[PDB]
């Protein structure tokens, strides 16, 4: 067994209606308030468009929910409604349905984001601190509301670098945390999957998102995106073990009594834990500080229970320059 160290009982202390998303009855707006303008590049199955809100002349984003089973539509809508107003959480404006096909669509605020592949190569030390701090605010918020995002990755963190705005998007994999519940491990992008997912440990919690955030921090400070670049899910764990070492991996499995897929016996090998300083080189030196490495070391831990919480991370000295300027 395992339990979240914080926010464990949030859903137990709310009404059944809060987390019982299968019972949620979405409230459909007028699809005719919105006029599609262009399809956005969001992924192989996505149908996401920029659109005009004809009622206020506002630019919006429309996400047509097609590939999904109905229970997951309710889950995403209910989660976005529960997080409405939250800090750095993408704002849901409306939920509409085609009258004829019945295909639902979610309408979101438009963020003028800079593609992460171009943005990450121009970030400075202070920019990374700032945007990581802003992302932590979103994660602390959703975790405090009893929700795990489960798909934190660069593509899901929209940054408008001119207005210094950040939004955590794509809540389609997010779920409510309940103590002792077993969750589907087929979540997250391969490169951002926590070790718990890779070894099929289902009793995970909000700390999954803190692994993913650590992966993003490492990628930014070391100019190595993604940080752990595996070729499949098995190799992904190897890539992690080549950095974190195998002894702590086997220690984690032993502690939680984790059933290890036997094909890992052949590929994991024996690896020492590498010191984080060893990933500094001439083209990332201006981004790396002892405070950054101290934080990263407390996020990228096998043992999900020993990772910092979002709030603990926000209190780390790495973020002092940001907190001071927010005063």
């Amino acid at each position: 067994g395992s339990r979240a160290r914080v926010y464990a009982e949030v859903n137990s202390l709310r009404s059944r209606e809060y987390w019982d998303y299968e019972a949620h009855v979405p409230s459909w707006g007028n699809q005719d308030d919105y006029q599609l303008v262009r399809k956005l590049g969001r992924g192989k199955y996505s149908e996401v468009f920029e659109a005009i809100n004809i009622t206020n002349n506002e630019r919006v984003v429309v996400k047509i929910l097609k590939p999904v089973k109905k229970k997951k539509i309710k889950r995403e809508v209910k989660i976005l409604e529960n997080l409405r107003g939250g800090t750095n959480i993408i704002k849901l404006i409306d939920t509409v349905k085609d009258p004829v096909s019945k295909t639902p669509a979610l309408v979101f605020e438009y963020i003028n984001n800079t593609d992460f592949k171009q943005l990450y190569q121009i970030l400075t030390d202070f920019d990374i601190r700032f945007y990581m701090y802003e992302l932590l605010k979103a994660l602390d918020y959703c975790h405090s509301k009893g929700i795990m995002h489960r798909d934190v990755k660069p593509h899901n963190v929209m940054i408008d670098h001119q207005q210094k705005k950040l939004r955590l998007i794509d809540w389609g994999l997010a779920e409510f945390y309940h103590p002792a519940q077993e969750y589907n491990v087929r979540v997250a992008s391969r490169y951002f999957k926590g070790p718990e997912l890779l070894v099929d440990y289902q009793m995970y919690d909000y700390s999954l998102d803190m692994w993913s955030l650590g992966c993003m921090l490492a990628s930014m400070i070391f100019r190595r995106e993604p940080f752990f670049h595996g070729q499949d899910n098995y190799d992904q764990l190897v890539r992690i073990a080549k950095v974190l070492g195998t002894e702590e991996l086997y220690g984690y499995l032993k502690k939680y009594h984790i059933d290890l897929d036997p094909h890992f016996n052949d590929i994991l090998g024996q690896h020492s834990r590498k010191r984080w300083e060893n990933f500094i080189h001439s083209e990332n030196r201006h981004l790396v500080s002892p405070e950054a490495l101290d934080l990263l070391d407390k996020l990228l831990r096998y043992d999900h229970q020993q990772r910092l919480t979002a709030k603990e991370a926000m209190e780390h000295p790495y973020f002092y320059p940001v907190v001071k300027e927010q005063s």
Partner: peptide, 5 residues
């Protein structure tokens, strides 16, 4: 497409 086309 919502509002025509």
């Amino acid at each position: 497409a919502x509002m025509v086309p």
